[PDB]
Design a protein around this ligand. Structure first.
Ligand SMILES: O=C(NC(=O)c1ccc(Cl)cc1)N[C@@H]1O[C@H](CO)[C@@H](O)[C@H](O)[C@H]1O
Ligand SMILES: O=C(NC(=O)c1ccc(Cl)cc1)N[C@@H]1O[C@H](CO)[C@@H](O)[C@H](O)[C@H]1O
Lengths: 813, 813
């Protein structure tokens, strides 16, 4: 049907149809008479998977023969979403499969909806790892993603009576056609025990053993015949584990205790919790991965060359135990001297930071590490002593610096600061947007920057244009390709060529047409799956991301109520119609975030049923926001809400997805928003609110929310409505916690940006009244989104951190 | 190579080779350079599995169109062993696959050894279910085996310092290529809750739900293109199960509690234990199975026709809850009146008993059923009242009969007698050998036989000649086929034709040659896998079965020590050399059985290292006895030990396996031994010991073991050796429990049969000295083993219980 989806040749279509029929028969053991739609999905998945196999085997043999430097991306999260369509895109199989299935009397889009998301992440950090894997394969890097195969990913969110309910994400229930178990590469991981000192150094003895069994998933590059590997570890009890009838039975049932390590993803993305099971998960991935790395390195004695053949990237501090684990292996097992082992470790490891909020930073209680990992604690203490010796030599007499920089934090409970461990043991430390990286050097890591300035870098985040344009928005991809060709898909900077089409009447009409089509489709999705009705002609005002106080869904809520109150005051006055959509999951233990979700639904309950409002304002909570839902809502959006308090959102990546898909942005100068505005031009962005410097000024003076309440009558009205029970008539004091926080302990200064926000929103509505000028500004955004391709990000990591050159060259098919 | 293994046609071999290469590439994602022997096994398994698929789909569609009466075999145990070779045998693919793999440079026998046993049973009862499935498919019956998919089957047995150690049988670790998950047929099972009475009858409410997910395994008939189904249920928690971060995490981890139902096979085959988890297993299989049966019946309103289209066979009392569960569904859900529901239930269900030992009978505490299954307890009480009303009418004034026959047993704890439930609710009750069925009518079920004589039947056990001749002993199968053709494989009575070859010099030599070859192969197996050395020219004296006091491995031990002591007394006297092999697992909580294993190894430790003995006597404990080991040792045996106390072994089936494979039998007149001797002629069996009547006489008088000790000097010597520490020099009193039991509380009268046993063993040695006459008696045994084919057994079940006619006719390929 459309050019960018590839060729549907007679040979290929015939071959796909027969292999589909073969899988339905031999693999699924069904015939057309009893086959369910799910059976048809699996037959298609197996058919597409077959095309990956040859390329997968030949890519891995290519790396063996060429022996390039290998990149190991370590993460506790890989937020992959669905695999079927992505695989078809990267193999140029989409149109062929579409035709093949059509001739069989099936709708491929219907089959695509059956696949479960691989929801092995919380949000931005996990999705970044996924985009990175795609870009690394597309840039021909010998890269491996290493993580945990959780049985249960991020919970499915149900909304019941306006409240979030959590249910288990049993994503493996029907099987996973993409993974391949590799029980032959099973490795032992050790826990507990004690340290014994011999003449020949330290020994870690009397340990409990858990087995790590790998499952491999292929990661296809975009049309370059490269297929890399994501290897996820699963926990298995050894067969003599815990080994009378009651006693025998119990010993077998107790195997669950060991296998619980890989059972479930921790869904807390707001607040670090020092739970033992999470620590076990973190060591489990690190220990199994490093053995695998060393094995591959030896199968190429001389560890001097280790950093020339191995790079390890730490996605946050979650896999930070790689540093003392590498030291443990090199010193205790390989018998290298400390200084040489440390040199190898530093040159091998690099660390990426994703937040400056102190409550999110990992600080493990010493007593936990003492019991679980006694040898690692000893190694950490030795690292600390040697590091602080260097600090004392560089800054003599500065005793407070010594306590500030220590890996060991004193207090009620002694803790290890995992961020300090990562900086000391890495040759590179990076933030994820220019402003974030600068904040790291000026604030929380200032002391470390002064000691070792060369270590600190910036690597601005990106998103893959395969999933986030071609896959989710084929209509937009096609109209662009019609003008400038197909090369932009793996060279996104080429979108700048669209600047010469900003006054092109045909292109203006096409861009606006694609957006309208996307909005109609999404409006239809809402009625079919959720029975909710919306006006497709309204401005689609969208805020989708995890629920956090810092992200300020609450500020959005205040604007919504303002709009509602203004309509009620002057009902017969014209306003630009809006559909306000807010979606995202709250961490199960985060009370305030759960209250914010309830507020959003409560506002909807009032606004959506007021006859005076009509179809001029609608408020919808988007249930179960996840990768597959993002692929639907983002192409449909007109307005992207990126309204975090300046200095709190390290980068954001949702912002980039909206920019690429033809939405305009209302946002603060925070994270990557700053660079987005710089690329597009400030005239083409809706910027409002305090800058980082303004926040700092307010903090020095003291933030008093009452001042704003006193001086802004429209804000006072909203707070009075919330307090008096206007949005909860049967529970008048339901939102008391929210009001109390806003009035007395708001870390994120919601009131301080309120006036500028509402003002800016008026300017948005003004522009939307002029469709041609709205669309011209959209074109200026799409045309300058090139910088935010994760291909650019990965090329910078490769050149400036890993010491490898990317390659766009094809491998033979 | 050999005729019975089928044709190796050019077309087939070429096709097998290419499909093997396809699976190695596409299914296993490997190439020949990195492929392990396990990969090669899986490639072959998938290749053979492909050949089953068409026949499997077309068999099941045939049953839908023809709508015959369906047979449902319910069992908590299916002792299947390996599947690869059995599938090749039944599809006539063995020679073709042998050639295909040979041309690929692989040894198929080596690949066969890689498959894990499906050890989902304890012994005879579980193996009977497996032979039955094979025979039902071979006889063209529309039969389904229903059970539990245990994650862990019977434990692997390790011998450490002469003691049994148990380790988990993680048989699914590498995957199971034979099964197909059917998550679309997942069904809910209810537990706990309470009973509510409405105007419209009883309601079972407030229950906990566990999901039952089916896995289907194909069961091929012998060369008739029939492929039936074994459906095994796996336990799954619902997604809102048990649904704060700690709280959310724990709720997900607690899903293990529900899924523990299908985790492990209970290994206690000696003594009934009323454990809650076992009760849950029993209801789980029954509840899921009956829903599946009813669904299939409705997809053919009128339950009068239910018994015309459905037969349910209960393998022991383990699935006895089918009776009140069927009543529950018919009365509570379908709203049938009690009397009609009961008529349907009785006509549908039949019950097979497997032992008369009281400690093995299921007697569930009422308090357990009260909590777990409150509605079933009510139904059982109602069944009991109505049944006892009939008893009182038939035998007026007989108050003791009423308490004897009650389903409810009074005492310290009230219990439900599950055997009484089964008799009351079944139209047929059978024992498993003629003597056993007679003992049931005369002793434990006498009262029930007097009330309803028509209910009681005999169905003598059998074994499948596919696995237990063609598969394990191809050399013997071939020499038989050379003389009488191939028809005997599915018509074992044809072996009677071999009686005209008893004086045939060529045949005598061939039979003896096959046995010698089998012994050499097994002697080689022992050295390679276990590093133990044996004389292949010695008489192979074998006792393999689960370790039980009633089976009297101890009597065998006494004979061994007698032989040893006689050699030590007269070293330069000639004795027929023997290799005494004893193998079998002990239930983990069975102390005496564990002591018996230690005794056997302790005897071996003395005997095998005595220079005066030389190679004249060897005692070996066969570690980890299981189906695949049985297939190796049975073809190698000369002497089969079947020495249970008369009246204790209901049938035995190991006995029949030895008879078919050319071993002579030393045995008591117990179980099927009686019928074996009747078929072959008493002259051609080594019969010794008390008959059932002699045991009864001794019990009336009182069994005094001291009498035998006092009057038999050779027995006295052995007991003195055991007591004084001759077989345990470092722990002199190690075997005190054994001596004490033998002397003071031996339920099974080991001493009473000792003299006759030793005497009979001398007659065995005498015959073995004359190879030609030994072999002629062997031929007379093989020739009369036809009755003991499970095809004969199943044909009798079909005609006399299920009301269906078997068919040997082919389905189209
Ligand atoms: O998503 C996360 N963090 C988590 O999910 C998280 C997960 C676990 C803990 Cl303990 C803390 C935080 N961080 C985000 O990373 C993105 C990728 O760099 C950034 O765009 C975003 O600013 C940041 O909040
Ligand atoms: O194997 C068993 N029983 C068990 O495994 C068993 C399993 C569980 C319990 Cl609670 C009790 C016994 N019984 C045997 O059945 C065979 C088949 O009918 C007979 O040949 C044999 O005599 C009998 O002991």
């Amino acid at each position: 049907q459309i050019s960018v989806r590839g060729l549907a040749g007679v040979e290929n279509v015939t071959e796909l149809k027969k292999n589909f029929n073969r899988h339905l028969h031999f693999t699924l053991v069904k015939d057309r008479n009893v086959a369910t739609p799910r059976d048809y999905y699996f037959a298609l998945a197996h058919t597409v998977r077959d095309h990956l196999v040859g390329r997968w085997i030949r890519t891995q043999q290519h790396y063996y023969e060429k022996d390039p430097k290998r990149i190991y991306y370590l993460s506790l999260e890989f937020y992959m979403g669905r695999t079927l369509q992505n695989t078809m895109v990267n193999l140029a199989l989409e149109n062929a499969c579409d035709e093949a299935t059509y001739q069989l009397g099936l709708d491929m889009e219907e089959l695509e909806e059956i696949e479960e998301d691989a929801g092995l992440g919380n949000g931005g950090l996990g999705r970044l790892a996924a985009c990175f894997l795609d870009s690394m394969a597309t840039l021909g890097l010998a890269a491996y993603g290493y993580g945990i195969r959780y049985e249960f990913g991020i919970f499915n969110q149900k909304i019941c009576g306006g409240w979030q309910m959590e249910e288990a994400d049993d994503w493996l229930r029907y099987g996973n056609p993409w993974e391949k178990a590799r029980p032959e590469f099973t490795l032992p991981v050790h826990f507990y025990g004690r340290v014994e000192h011999t003449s020949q150094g330290a020994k870690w003895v009397d340990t409990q053993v858990v087995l790590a069994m790998p499952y491999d998933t292929p990661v296809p590059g975009y049309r370059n015949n490269v297929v890399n590997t994501m290897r996820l570890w699963s926990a298995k009890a050894p067969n003599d584990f815990n080994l009378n009838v009651g006693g025998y039975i119990q010993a077998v049932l107790d195997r669950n205790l060991a296998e619980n390590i890989s059972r479930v993803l921790y869904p807390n993305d707001n607040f670090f919790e020092g739970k033992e099971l999470r620590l076990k998960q973190e060591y489990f991935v690190v220990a199994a991965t490093l053995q695998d790395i060393i094995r591959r390195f030896k199968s190429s004695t001389n560890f001097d060359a280790f950093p020339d053949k191995v790079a390890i990237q730490l996605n946050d501090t979650h896999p930070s135990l790689a540093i003392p684990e590498l030291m443990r292996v090199l010193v205790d097992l390989e018998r290298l001297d400390w200084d040489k082992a440390w040199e190898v470790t530093v040159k091998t490891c690099a660390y990426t930071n994703h937040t400056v909020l102190p409550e999110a930073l990992e600080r493990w209680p010493v007593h936990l590490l003492e019991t679980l990992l006694p040898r690692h604690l000893q190694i950490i203490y030795e690292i600390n002593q040697r590091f602080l010796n260097r600090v004392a030599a560089a800054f003599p007499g500065d005793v407070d610096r010594l306590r500030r920089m220590s890996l060991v934090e004193e207090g009620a409970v002694k803790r290890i600061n995992m961020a300090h461990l990562c900086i000391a043991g890495s040759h590179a430390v990076n933030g994820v947007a220019r402003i974030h990286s600068e904040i790291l050097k000026k604030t929380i890591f200032k002391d470390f920057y002064e000691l070792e300035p060369h270590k600190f870098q910036n690597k601005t985040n990106g998103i893959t244009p395969r999933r986030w344009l071609v896959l989710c928005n084929p209509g937009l991809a096609e109209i662009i390709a019609e003008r400038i060709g197909e090369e932009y898909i793996s060279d996104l900077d080429q979108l700048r060529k669209l600047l010469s089409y900003v006054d092109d009447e045909a292109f203006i009409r096409d861009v606006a047409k694609v957006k309208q089509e996307n909005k109609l489709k999404f409006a239809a999705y809402l009625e079919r799956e959720y029975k909710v009705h919306i006006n497709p002609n309204s401005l689609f005002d969208v805020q989708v991301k995890r629920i956090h106080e810092y992200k300020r869904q609450l500020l959005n809520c205040l604007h919504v109520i303002t709009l509602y109150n203004r309509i009620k005051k002057e009902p017969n006055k014209f306003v630009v119609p809006r559909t306000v959509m807010i979606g995202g999951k709250a961490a199960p233990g985060y009370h305030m975030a759960k209250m914010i979700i309830k507020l959003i639904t409560a506002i909807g309950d009032v606004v959506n049923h007021d006859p005076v409002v009509g179809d001029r304002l609608r408020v919808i909570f988007l249930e179960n926001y996840r990768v597959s839902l993002a692929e639907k809502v983002i192409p449909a959006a007109d307005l992207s809400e990126q309204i975090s308090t300046a200095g709190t959102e390290a980068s954001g990546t949702g912002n980039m997805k909206f920019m690429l898909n033809g939405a305009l942005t209302i946002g603060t100068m925070d994270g990557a928003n700053v660079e987005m505005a710089e690329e597009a031009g400030e005239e083409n962005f809706f910027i409002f609110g305090m800058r980082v410097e303004d926040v700092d000024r307010l903090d020095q003076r003291g933030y008093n929310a009452q001042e704003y309440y006193d001086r802004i009558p429209e804000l006072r009205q909203i707070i009075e409505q919330l307090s008096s029970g206007f949005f909860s008539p049967k529970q008048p004091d339901l939102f008391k916690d929210i009001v109390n926080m806003l009035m007395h302990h708001d870390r994120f200064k919601v009131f301080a940006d309120y006036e500028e926000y509402v003002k800016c929103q008026e300017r948005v509505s003004a522009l939307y009244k002029n469709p041609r000028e709205w669309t011209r500004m959209v074109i200026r955004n799409i045309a300058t989104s090139g910088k935010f391709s994760s291909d650019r990000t990965i090329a910078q990591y490769a050149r400036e951190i890993w010491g490898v050159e990317p390659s766009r060259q094809r491998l033979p098919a």
